[PDB]
Amino acid sequence: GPIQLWQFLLELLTDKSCQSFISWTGDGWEFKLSDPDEVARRWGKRKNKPKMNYEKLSRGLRYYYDKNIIHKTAGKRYVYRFVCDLQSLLGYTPEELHAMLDVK
DNA sequence: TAGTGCCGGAGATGT
DNA sequence: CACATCTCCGGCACT
């Protein structure tokens, strides 16, 4: 109703003009917030939260671990991975979407 | 070092 | 009373 965080990220991850601060790493559904501050800034404006930052935003993401919606890529900073059936949800395969988005 | 990423508990919050 | 954060926090690990 009032868009969820994992849905927000997907929204960005499927818009070329947002590749500057968030993007697919080419490996399946794993993505990277190259500019966490910019992601958190936009997250903040969406939900109307002037004090939103990555520290908080990431707390939202860790909530998704048990929910098996998004998982953390251990070892790579600002990198996480959608572990849920995004193929059925979006209708595309990682390859198909990457292609469509021109992911390198 | 202190700074920063990252973790997950807990009370607060409400475009 | 639910619910998805939001906010804060003590902790651990790495550089």
Side-chain angles (χ1 to χ4, degrees):
Chain A
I3 196 74
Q4 302 174 85
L5 182 55
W6 73 265
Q7 268 292 182
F8 180 69
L9 294 186
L10 239 33
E11 172 186 350
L12 293 189
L13 285 183
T14 59
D15 178 355
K16 265 181 158 298
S17 72
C18 291
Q19 302 203 52
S20 171
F21 45 84
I22 182 162
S23 58
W24 301 97
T25 77
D27 172 16
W29 298 121
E30 165 184 278
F31 62 109
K32 182 196 227 297
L33 287 63
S34 73
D35 188 359
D37 291 326
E38 179 57 357
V39 176
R41 201 207 88 198
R42 304 202 164 188
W43 177 220
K45 82 170 176 181
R46 181 58 69 79
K47 296 286 296 296
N48 280 88
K49 284 297 181 175
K51 317 294 179 176
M52 175 61 47
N53 55 48
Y54 177 70
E55 264 181 293
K56 292 171 195 156
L57 188 158
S58 61
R59 188 21 180 135
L61 299 183
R62 306 198 275 294
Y63 271 126
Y64 297 146
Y65 300 168
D66 296 319
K67 288 190 181 186
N68 281 304
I69 296 299
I70 291 165
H71 271 4
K72 172 66 184 178
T73 293
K76 269 109 166 184
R77 117 169 168 291
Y78 305 168
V79 177
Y80 303 84
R81 181 203 289 292
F82 285 105
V83 290
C84 58
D85 188 329
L86 275 188
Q87 194 173 297
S88 299
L89 179 49
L90 305 176
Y92 294 128
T93 187
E95 288 63 43
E96 277 167 341
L97 186 55
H98 293 352
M100 184 167 256
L101 288 170
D102 292 327
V103 176
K104 300 184 179 194

